[PDB]
């Protein structure tokens, strides 16, 4: 719908270029910063594929965080088209830039990872963009998970506890959009807001629950089971629409997919491992890597034994059925008369 461009030309001086792909007969245009400071108000209906420019100011309180620039075209009625972009700005002197550029080129050439993938690793480890030993440990696991499970880099990022990327690159749509927005469900774009999604088993929820089912290829019942794997502390089946909860659900679905398990076979196996009470919501990087090795060891072992997870869970379960069968009744009659 939109192409938003931001250009620095000094301290706190930014040129905002923007372009609309889709036409709306709008009363006015309103560009706002974090929906709180109105940068630009233009009183016409903007034409499609015209690059409009604007000079704005952004102080260091806004530069410090990833900020969002939203563009609102308000119709003569109450309706209003809206689209927004999230900008992350950072500044360097020329020495420290070339040193960090040195690290990025030397690492991407040696690993054959994309620079966008490497930035996803680094931002997952620490807030500043610094490569250290903990970064290189995730770079190993990213390369190991591609080889082991025949997945891409952006999929192996999710197994290294990184969020789903909303950043599109190499003339492909983002990992977010290919998961959630291809195609658009009934012309509706799925965004990460604060809206709750009721993931109960008998919910018959909104269209946002349908987006999760199309993304993860599961029904309502497996989606509630995926929720309790993600968090055992959800009293209701409601999560918010933010990117952390969407990534944690996508960790649990990937763990079932890369081992050729269903969500029901995954829950029985995580109980059978000993991870039945450790939730994937608040999990460390080391604990997640330990949990994948436990799943990788046992799933590969079940193929050599030629067993099911269902056969494994019979030998492993501590929950016992309390129903007097004829087999047990024969055991009770023999030990009674024998002893």
């Amino acid at each position: 719908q939109m192409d938003v461009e931001l250009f620095p030309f000094g301290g706190e001086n930014y040129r905002l270029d923007y372009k609309f792909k889709n036409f709306y007969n709008a009363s006015y245009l309103s560009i706002k910063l974090n929906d709180k400071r109105e940068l630009v108000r233009t009183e016409g209906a903007p034409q499609v594929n015209i690059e409009y420019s604007a000079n704005i100011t952004l102080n260091t309180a806004d530069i410090s965080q990833p900020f969002e620039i939203g563009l609102t075209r308000v119709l003569p009625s109450g309706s209003w088209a809206y689209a927004a972009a999230k900008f992350t700005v950072e500044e360097y002197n020329q020495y420290s830039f070339l040193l960090k550029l040195n690290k990025a080129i030397r690492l991407s050439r040696a690993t054959e990872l994309s620079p966008t993938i490497l930035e996803g690793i680094v931002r997952s480890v620490n807030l500043q963009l610094d490569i250290n030993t903990d970064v290189l440990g995730k770079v190993f696991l990213t390369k190991y998970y591609m080889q082991r499970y025949a997945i891409h880099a952006e999929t192996a990022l999710i197994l290294c506890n990184a969020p789903i990327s909303q950043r599109s690159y190499d003339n492909q749509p983002s990992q977010f959009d290919r998961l959630f927005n291809t195609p658009l469900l009934n012309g509706q774009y799925f965004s990460t807001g604060d809206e709750e999604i009721d993931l109960n088993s008998g919910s018959t929820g909104d269209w946002r629950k349908t987006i999760l089912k199309r993304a993860f290829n599961i029904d309502d019942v497996s989606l509630f089971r995926l929720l309790k794997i993600t968090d055992h502390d959800n009293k209701d089946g409601k999560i918010k629409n933010n990117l952390k909860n969407l990534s944690n659900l996508y960790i649990g679905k990937l763990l079932a997919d890369i081992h050729q398990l269903t969500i029901d076979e995954l829950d029985l196996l995580l109980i059978a491992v000993g991870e039945g009470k450790t939730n994937l919501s608040a999990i460390s990087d080391k604990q997640l890597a330990t949990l994948i090795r436990k799943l990788n060891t046992i799933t590969s072992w079940l193929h050599t034994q030629k067993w099911s997870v269902f056969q494994l869970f019979i030998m492993t379960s501590t929950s016992y059925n309390k129903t007097l069968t004829p087999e047990i009744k024969n055991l009770l009659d023999t030990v009674y008369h024998g002893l």
Binding site: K21, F23, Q47, V48, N49, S79, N171, N186, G187
Partner: protein
């Protein structure tokens, strides 16, 4: 209004989807409807 961009020259899409997009724009403009899903509402009801 079409942009002479590299993407409009390179990426392939269905001719039928581009034709359905063109019909939906004109029907939205004629019927004065909000979006495409309201157009599909009135075609669910339209008898003549």
């Amino acid at each position: 209004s079409m942009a002479l961009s590299q993407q409009n020259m390179d990426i392939e899409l269905s001719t039928l989807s581009l034709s359905n997009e063109l019909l939906l724009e004109s029907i939205k403009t004629e019927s004065k409807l909000e979006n495409y899903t309201k157009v599909m509402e009135m075609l669910s009801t339209f008898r003549p």
